[PDB]
Design a protein around this ligand. Structure first.
Ligand SMILES: COC(=O)c1cccc(NS(C)(=O)=O)c1
Lengths: 412, 412
């Protein structure tokens, strides 16, 4: 019978900071982490900026010897996972190791590593392919390398549901705990798709902002002048814990995870439907799961990708789910500042939602100068809004029309 | 209390055939799907063979427009899903479409398209990358495209847990039904890693059989002359359905999925431990989930990959779990014949496990000419064995020490 799941630990790499509090500081100040990309030459690309992780030192977590074998996406997952576990103060013993698992997801996984090894194969032949290519690049190795390093013998898996990976990864880890399969899960995602194939691939789709000359203003969710999403890199991890297990060890509890919703648009491979019908079905699943009256929802951390079609469909989905109460809650897209971390977006945004609850403040949607046709909600334009937040909601929407919703609330 | 989950439809592309009955005819006759890989220069490669899908006609499934947009691994999963849905007799309606979801996974995803779009990027630059590169290539697009073609609005996701993908996909789909989030799920996996990056990547780790001279004898699980796994292509898809829902529409029920177990080894990135302690915990977990005593098990579809470390760890884990019953059960590796479909291994093997229940026969381990040290179990060497099978287990172990077990039971 269903058990309660709380957040005891969190960890992060974002374009705004090398940890949770440095990133959060940035969210509330309305700072941008978007800048021209330097690790490669992008003069042949229509988009030349992104949300880079700045000054990451992997040797704060791992040996240079192991780091050399692993794609940045894994290094980012491990970094945030280590932060989360440390921040929970949990000690892994023989008594508990079978009851602690991990679910860290990614959309694309180790694409830099695959690109480079493709370069070696086409330039020099198959004998130049790294022996570490596969285990150093595949999406499930954040879960595997984390389990090897900490000795987690619990459920060990990884989702790839594109831009919804983070939300789904957290939600299903919660179901693991709630229904007895584990007492603790390390959950979230990591992405690093800032290579030629990513910026080029999203380029060819015409899916990205091309505001090369003002990169900090490019991601402008619900603004009339938005021209696509901003590609960003990073990681989010949370320690999810069964409540009594958290109590029994005097764990500091940030919030409760009360509800998780999934739905498929069954509409289009890449475009969300204009109405947000699938997003609406997903949010309703989440509220029912949480046993809530929708008027209890105080903050929504929107997906808010800064795409024409994506942003407007959220507004419809929300108005549709929350009727007149749509006008009373506060909804923001932190992707105004971080950009879109793809498979990591749901993970870092889950953490912002939990810190919104702890600090009783809605983060801003920056660059929202001229809200677009029908974008007439409290979108927290420009500046953080101190306010009462008892129940917070994090949405994610991805290619394949795959939707995920997380519901958190204050815990007493 | 939990809802019972049965199998009402199954679908497959394998190296043994273009559907289930053809595949299963191969398995029981002990035929091999392994052969030199064609229309592809493997001169510079230590491995020149594997399990191809022979004669696949995607225009039976998709228009040529929509098949050109999609990586072969998506084509293969869609073919298995469409087969499985057809095989179930299920009718999708506005009344049930919110209760039908998809969890089709992949280990590696769209390598072939990454290779080809890479060729474009290096030779000619980023402007030659396909607009459909990203959505044509990412692992969740079997779930995505299937949901769009059939109007499935249920839980829509994808796992990627390396060689455990297929087993985890089916188990977690079963969970979605058992606990009332869906009444039907299409679950399993697909893979097409028979490109340069795949043969090269697994080549570079010396993980592959190089018995180039006798490709049909290369896969020889538990035989003393084994020298690594054979790389194979294809897909498996099962329609999972809540029992009362199947019964109401008078569906043919193949068998019941009664148990699902997971564990992590927390040992090595690619090698299991010697004693299979992790696989042991995973099997124990599945049998507990099924309310089953180990003595009740009759058949095991092994992971049985034909690696030296992997084949022997599995024997130790079967001896540790089953003790005095370990020689009475029958355990064969159908990879002896199909080779290793990686993410799709668990799905076609769940199907072979369901048909071992239907037809009351253990598939052979072919090539088991000389059992190795301590490989003294009933491994069904050379030839299919008719016998009593009430309960059958399917095992999948994966890079990152990610373990998954499914327990099937006869239905009446
Ligand atoms: C996966 O383990 C569970 O116990 C469980 C129980 C109930 C529902 C679910 N849904 S999910 C997490 O697979 O999306 C899982």
């Amino acid at each position: 019978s269903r058990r309660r799941v709380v957040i005891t630990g969190m960890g992060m790499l974002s374009p705004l900071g090398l940890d949770v509090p440095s990133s959060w500081e940035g969210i509330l100040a309305g700072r941008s982490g978007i800048a021209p990309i330097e690790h490669m030459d992008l003069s042949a690309y229509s988009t030349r900026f992104g949300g880079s992780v700045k000054g990451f030192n992997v040797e704060e977590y791992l040996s240079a010897k192991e780091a050399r074998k692993l794609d940045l996406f894994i290094q980012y997952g491990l970094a945030a996972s280590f932060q989360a576990v440390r921040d929970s103060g949990l000690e892994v013993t023989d008594a508990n190791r079978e009851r602690i698992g991990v679910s860290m997801g990614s959309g694309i996984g180790g694409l830099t590593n695959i690109e480079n090894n493709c370069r070696s194969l086409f330039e020099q032949g198959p004998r130049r392919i790294s022996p570490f290519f596969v285990p150093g690049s595949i999406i499930n190795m954040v879960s595997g390398f984390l389990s090897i390093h900490l000795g987690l013998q619990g459920p060990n898996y990884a989702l790839t549901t594109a831009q919804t990976t983070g939300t789904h990864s957290i939600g299903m880890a919660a179901r693991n705990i709630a229904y007895g399969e584990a007492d603790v899960m390390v959950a979230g995602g990591s992405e690093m798709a800032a290579c030629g194939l990513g910026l080029g691939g999203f380029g060819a789709a015409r899916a990205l902002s091309t505001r090369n000359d003002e990169p900090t203003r490019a991601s402008r969710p619900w603004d009339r002048d938005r021209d696509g999403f901003v590609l960003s890199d990073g990681s989010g991890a949370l320690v999810l814990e069964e409540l009594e297990h958290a109590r029994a060890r005097g764990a500091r509890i940030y919030a409760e995870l009360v509800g998780f919703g999934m739905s498929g648009d069954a509409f289009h491979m890449t475009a969300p439907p204009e109405d947000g019908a699938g997003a609406a079905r997903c949010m309703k699943n989440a509220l029912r799961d949480a046993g809530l009256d929708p008027r209890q929802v105080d903050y929504i951390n929107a997906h808010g990708t800064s795409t024409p079609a994506g942003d407007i469909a959220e507004i419809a989905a929300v108005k549709s789910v929350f009727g007149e109460h749509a006008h009373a809650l506060s909804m923001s897209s932190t992707k105004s500042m971080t950009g879109h971390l793809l498979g990591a977006a749901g993970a870092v945004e889950a953490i912002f939602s939990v810190l919104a609850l702890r600090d009783q403040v809605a983060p801003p949607t920056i660059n929202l100068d001229n809200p677009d046709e029908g974008c007439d909600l409290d979108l927290v334009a420009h500046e953080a809004k101190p306010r009462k937040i008892d129940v917070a909601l994090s949405n994610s929407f991805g290619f394949g029309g795959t939707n995920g919703t997380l519901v958190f609330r204050r815990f007493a």
